[PDB]
Design a protein around this nucleic acid. Structure first.
Ligand SMILES: [Cl-]
Lengths: 525, 98, 93, 87, 107, 93, 107, 86, 95
DNA sequence: ATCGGATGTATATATCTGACACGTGCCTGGAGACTAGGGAGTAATCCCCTTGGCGGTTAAAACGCGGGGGACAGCGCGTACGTGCGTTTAAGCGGTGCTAGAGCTGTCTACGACCAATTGAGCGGCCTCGGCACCGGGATTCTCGA
DNA sequence: TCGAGAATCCCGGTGCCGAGGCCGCTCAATTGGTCGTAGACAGCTCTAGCACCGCTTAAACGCACGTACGCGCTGTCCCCCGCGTTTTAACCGCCAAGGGGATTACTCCCTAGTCTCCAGGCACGTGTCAGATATATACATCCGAT
């Protein structure tokens, strides 16, 4: 094409391009109701106020082409060959498009992700002959990764990153966005919020959003902005759907298909608010088939083999005396939240004035006023003979400070990554620790930090020195060392304090983890 | 030699710029930190509403602006154009806060 | 949940002086606070004025004296004239 | 030593030099000395102590652990600095 | 009979009934008269009309057809009687009147 | 006639704090004015507190809040101590 | 039975019946608690005793036996935070604190 | 009652009276233009206070001004006077 | 013959120690009941009413001079001036 | 440095008037029933505030340097104050008369309180579409070396 | 002294979200009807205000003088402003779980208000004396000219 052909089609033909289209919604209703009959609940729920969807129901009910182009082994337009299951995923995506609906891709991280995405976009451009636009929203750390992937396995397209300062972004927008000189626009979340108005006035085909779990709260500004965007269909990429609740799965679905899953109350009354008998069991959970067509997930135990599994263990430490007195002080009464309980369960010196004196000393007395730290010290001493390097996680960097001072008190070699360390020093740190012969025994980290590109694959043991409300965050921290790469047995040691709130945190985490287990994992297929 | 204004001609421009707008001239977060660590004295474990902190900042800014105006009059009366701590001390002493 | 305010009357006075001028929300809050403050001042002064003369009833005479005390210059003059006019009209009706 | 978080800059130093300069400009001054930047901080701290004391008295009489804007308005009106636009 | 509001009988706009109730429940006296709410409503109406007229004039001067706290501040502080009435009061988001001391201007 | 005052009580307090000093008529009148002014201030603050919290009764809690809100610092602490011990003795007896 | 005044019950010297009657017929609230008059009388007695011992100290400092408005003014103005309480108050036949600025004094 | 309307009685606030007030204020040296300013400010203060006192007197239906009314006016202005009542 | 300043300082010490009235009672009364007849006509006055007026007036003027002096000292003078009063009562809030 | 005035400052004595003590009565505070309603206790629920942390943008904030103009000090001078002394003048006291109007008592209406029934006026919730904020760009204007 | 350049204002031309109508509901304002008592209104009393007249004698007033002080001018540092350049913290957003507070809806109990009686507390009218002025009077203690 040429820029003028792009201008005649991309821009919104009308002032208000947002309006109710009947053909598409009728097609969706007929196809889905052909697939299964449970959807009548949603349709009657949405027809309560607005009755034109009820006449759609009537016309599609009383009256009782998605060509099976299997799109086999990798076509030449995408360079090279690739995983057959990835062809299966692309076939899934093609059929999803040909049924005029969208669907979450929930492949586990590292299992050839975004490759099926670029291949599907190439399929759209060559078999469907349709050019752009294609908005791609990814975290900033992956913008250049996406661009490189696109330009090295399907180079004969147009794709640029929309990053830069205010003026550089503005000139780039006027040159290309308003210039209509693209096929795919790589952009970041913050950029999507920033450049709302220019991006609205485009007739979008798809809006690919990688790590879709970021959109899980429907009061989030990004969700509102994406709702305000006009587009023909959507596509979602995320490895951990339904992280800590069932409602957020509906939140993903609503953005996916805003005409099907348009009611929160219907979905949360589908299963959640009924716990008396088998009605909280096999039948109601098998009613999941509503979630069957909209999602696909695959595991690292179907594909690459390798990576021996995990050996998660629990180390039930016992409260220490100073911990005991601080814990009793906290319980009955600065301190303004229950988080103080978890702080005390971790190490008393986090509270001010816990260090005696203070004359500032860093002697052996540190482990004395700590329950978990003594077990940690013994564990490190035992592991030192076998020389297995260590990744310690935590929830507070302020705790990592105490831990690292302990670390160099016993003459060990650590290396930190926190929210305050910049990008370049982070990269040099990960290079140093991952050196072919690195003289840094332990490595420190925060559970919800560093993004996903970190490749700390050189070690074998990972202690979750503190737990998290969301088990998914801990799982990300664990696969941070359990990803493809590391081949020795990854060993993970969570530390739990007895007779304290940490038991309750672990128990709720297990509830949410097993909820995730029953909702998705068995029906993952 | 690049263009350079003479002293005072940017000061008056800022005077007439700021005497025309209405926004708050102090940053929100430092002021909130200030009146939380001040409130820690009289009673501990307090929760502050955003509206309460906003009202506090409005009142304090108005107070300081009026005080600086009277300090300016004191400095002018002393045949000067620069304000000094003695002017503020006199302004607060006259009005009755000292 | 039901909170009463003078907004619906201030925006009837406004549409009689400037029939095509709107008023923002913050200005509306300021107007409500202003009428509340003036009501408090007049009522307190009239109550004290009644207590001084050993009277149990607050009435238009105390209201007149209180507005003559609180308001400066021509403002008090016009307010007193308007109050007398309204009272006479009401008692005639 | 890095166990102990290095003591942060004092909170009263959060009223920076440019902020006091902006307040003085709106007040209408042209030149500014170098000691105003501490005299003003002292004055602001004293004013804040008074108003906070009154507001806390109100909010603990009401049997609440929450200072509220209407309590702040009451305190200001008590001091004789009535404020319109918050209650 | 047919209801007929006291405000309408007085030819006013402010709520005479609600002013009466506030006077009666505010613990100002043992018992309120009958013309007191009418007089007080008239006075409040006058003051509000004056403030709003000046503020609308300021808004028209600033070429905006909507009153804002800046316009209220300009209206109040540019009239002597209103400024004397509201000397202690501070208007939130009000600002300051433009003012530069004469000796501060360039020679 | 029969104008009432606090002279008979101020004199008792004087004779128990300084057993052999007197007080002139003008000074006694000034003390009477002081007592009335402080009583009015405290009662007004207590009334505004009770209205603020939508209570309909003045009680020792309102009086204590008013005194701690009106008197500066050290005077406030001693006044609170005096009031609490007096009320406890009254309740016991 | 023989009546016992509430001021004698509480061990006070100011009248509690008079304070209760004033609080009642003073238009402060609909209802008045029973401990409030006692507490208020105690506070008034405290303030009177404080200012009065200061005045007596001043009177003895001037070799006078009786107390006069000059002594009251001296006591109030000399005592900090009693000066703050009587900040806007004017005492008849009082005076001023002896005070001369430093730069006015002879070399 | 008879022969009471007078003029220029502000000249009765004599210059030595101004100087005595200045001495009680602790003023050592006095300029010559100061007396007109003092008379003006005294006249303004008296006008305000007397206006309020006359308002109270008129409301009470009296036509004699009482020290208690003067005290009310002063207190309303915010200048509480101790000694004459209340 | 004394030098300029000595008699002024002794007068300061004298008048900062007495309590009596610095303005003449009958001239003040004439001024008061002259100002009165501009609001209502044919008024009577109480002796204690005029006395209270004088007691408030002199207190006001003394308090004003105590600030005029500070304003004068702030300008490196010892003499008080009309501009000193104007600044003092403009800062105090009386305009 | 010394000496000569002039001004507070102790010291004794007489005068008086104002504070303090004492007797009466009358009105108000206390004692004792009786009650109702205001406030305390409980319990759903729905939204806001706290604490610790992370990731990203981007204006403010901080630091540095030059240099100019303003503060501070010193000096001269020419008034404009302070001090002191006669000499008018009017304020203060002391008394008298005249009277109005401030204050207290009776009483008997109008008029405000309280209650029941009723109903519109005002309040909360929703939707929308002009008024205003924002962003160039072009033109004006206002300052600063010559 | 007039050009050069930076700042500002005024046009159009977007967008977005707050004001501003519109509707349903409910609960306080309105109407009608007692009734108990503040408070006009009249009448009587006598206290405090007003008005002069006279004396006396201290505070004001006018005039001289001479002398510190306020004001203007001149230098000179120095310190604060204006402009660059680099750093950093404020400001959005987003996550997790709690408790806190604001409603609304109740239940119930104990503590006020309302009466009726009745004696003591206090207010007023007196009748004393000693604490505080008034006079002198000697002493000590700054202040100013040699
Ligand atoms: Cl991935």
């Amino acid at each position: 094409h040429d820029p003028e052909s792009n201008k005649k089609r991309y821009l919104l033909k009308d002032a208000n391009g947002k309006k109710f289209d009947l053909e598409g919604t009728t097609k969706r209703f007929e196809h889905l109701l052909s697939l299964s009959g449970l959807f009548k609940h949603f349709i009657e729920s949405k027809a309560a106020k607005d009755p034109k969807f009820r006449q759609v129901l009537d016309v599609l009910e009383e009256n009782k082409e998605s060509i099976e182009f299997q799109f086999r082994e990798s076509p030449a337009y995408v360079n090279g060959q690739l995983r057959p299951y990835q062809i299966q995923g692309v076939n899934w995506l093609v059929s999803l498009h040909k049924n005029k609906i969208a669907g979450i891709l929930a492949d586990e991280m590292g299992l050839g992700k975004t490759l099926q995405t670029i291949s599907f976009l190439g399929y759209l451009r060559y078999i469907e002959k349709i050019p752009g636009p294609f908005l791609v929203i990814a975290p900033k750390s992956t913008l250049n990764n996406w661009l490189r992937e696109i330009n090295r396995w399907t180079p004969d397209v147009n794709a640029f990153i929309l990053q830069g300062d205010k003026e550089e972004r503005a000139e780039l927008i006027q040159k290309k966005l308003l210039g209509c000189d693209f096929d795919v626009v790589i952009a970041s979340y913050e950029i999507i919020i920033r450049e709302k108005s220019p991006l609205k006035k485009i007739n979008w085909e798809y809006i690919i959003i990688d790590e879709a779990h970021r959109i899980k709260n429907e009061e989030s500004m990004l969700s509102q902005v994406l709702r305000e965007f006009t587009s023909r269909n959507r596509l979602l990429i995320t490895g951990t759907p339904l992280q800590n609740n069932l409602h957020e799965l509906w939140a993903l679905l609503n953005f996916l298909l805003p005409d099907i899953f348009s009611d929160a109350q219907d979905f949360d009354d589908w299963f959640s608010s009924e716990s008396t008998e088998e009605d909280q069991d096999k039948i109601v959970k098998q009613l999941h088939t509503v979630l069957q067509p909209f999602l696909l997930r695959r595991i690292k135990s179907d594909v690459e083999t390798s990576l021996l599994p995990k050996k998660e263990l629990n180390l039930y430490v016992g409260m220490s005396s100073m911990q005991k007195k601080w814990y009793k002080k906290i319980l009955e009464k600065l301190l303004n939240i229950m988080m103080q309980l978890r702080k005390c369960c971790n190490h008393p010196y986090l509270f001010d004035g816990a260090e005696p004196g203070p004359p500032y000393t860093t002697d052996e007395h540190l482990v004395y006023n700590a329950a978990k730290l003594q077990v940690l010290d013994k564990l490190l001493k035992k592991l030192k003979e076998e020389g297995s390097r260590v990744l310690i996680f935590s929830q507070m960097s302020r705790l990592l400070d105490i831990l690292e001072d302990y670390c160099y008190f016993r003459n060990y070699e650590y290396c930190r990554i926190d929210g305050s360390t910049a990008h370049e020093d982070r990269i040099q740190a990960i290079d140093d620790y991952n050196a072919p012969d690195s003289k840094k025994f332990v490595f420190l980290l925060t559970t919800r930090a560093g993004g996903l590109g970190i490749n700390l694959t050189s070690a074998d043991v990972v202690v979750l020195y503190d737990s998290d409300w969301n088990p998914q965050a801990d799982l990300q921290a664990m696969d941070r060392a359990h990803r493809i790469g590391q081949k020795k047995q990854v060993k993970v040691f969570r530390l739990v304090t007895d007779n304290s709130v940490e038991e309750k945190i672990l128990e709720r985490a297990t509830q949410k983890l097993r909820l995730d287990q029953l909702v998705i994992q068995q029906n993952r297929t | 030699k690049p263009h350079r204004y003479r002293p005072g001609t940017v000061a008056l421009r800022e005077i007439r710029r700021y005497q025309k707008s209405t926004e708050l001239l102090i940053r929100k977060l430092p002021f909130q930190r200030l009146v939380r660590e001040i409130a820690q004295d009289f009673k501990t474990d307090l929760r502050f509403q955003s509206s309460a902190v906003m009202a506090l900042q409005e009142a304090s800014e108005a107070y300081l602006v009026a005080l600086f105006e009277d300090t300016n009059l004191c400095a002018i009366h002393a045949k000067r154009v620069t304000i000094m701590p003695k002017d503020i001390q006199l302004a607060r002493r006259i009005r009755g806060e000292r | 949940t039901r909170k009463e305010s003078y907004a619906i009357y201030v925006y009837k006075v406004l549409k009689q002086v400037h029939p095509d001028t709107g008023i923002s929300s913050k200005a509306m809050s300021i107007m409500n606070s202003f009428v509340n403050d003036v009501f408090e001042r007049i009522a307190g002064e009239a109550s004290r004025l009644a207590h001084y003369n050993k009277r149990s009833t607050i009435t238009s005479r105390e209201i007149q004296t209180a507005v003559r005390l609180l308001l400066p210059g021509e403002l008090a003059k016009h307010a007193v004239s308007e109050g007398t006019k309204a009272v006479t009209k009401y008692t005639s009706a | 030593a890095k166990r102990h978080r290095k003591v942060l800059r004092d909170n009263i130093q959060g009223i920076t030099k440019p902020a006091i300069r902006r307040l003085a400009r709106r007040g209408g001054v042209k030149r500014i000395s170098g000691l105003i930047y501490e005299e003003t901080r002292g004055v602001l701290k004293v004013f804040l102590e008074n108003v906070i004391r009154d507001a806390v008295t109100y909010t603990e009489h009401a049997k609440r652990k929450t200072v509220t804007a209407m309590d702040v308005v009451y305190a200001l009106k008590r001091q004789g600095r009535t404020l319109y636009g918050f209650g | 009979a047919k209801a007929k509001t006291r405000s309408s009988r007085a030819g006013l706009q402010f709520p005479v009934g609600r002013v009466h109730r506030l006077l009666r429940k505010g613990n100002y006296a043992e018992r309120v008269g009958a013309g007191a709410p009418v007089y007080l409503a008239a006075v409040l109406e006058y003051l509000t009309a004056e403030i709003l007229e000046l503020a609308g004039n300021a808004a028209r001067d600033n070429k905006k057809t909507r009153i804002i706290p800046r316009h209220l501040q300009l209206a109040v502080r540019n009239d002597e009687e209103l400024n004397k009435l509201l000397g202690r009061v501070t208007i939130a988001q009000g600002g300051v009147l433009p003012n530069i001391q004469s000796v501060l201007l360039p020679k």
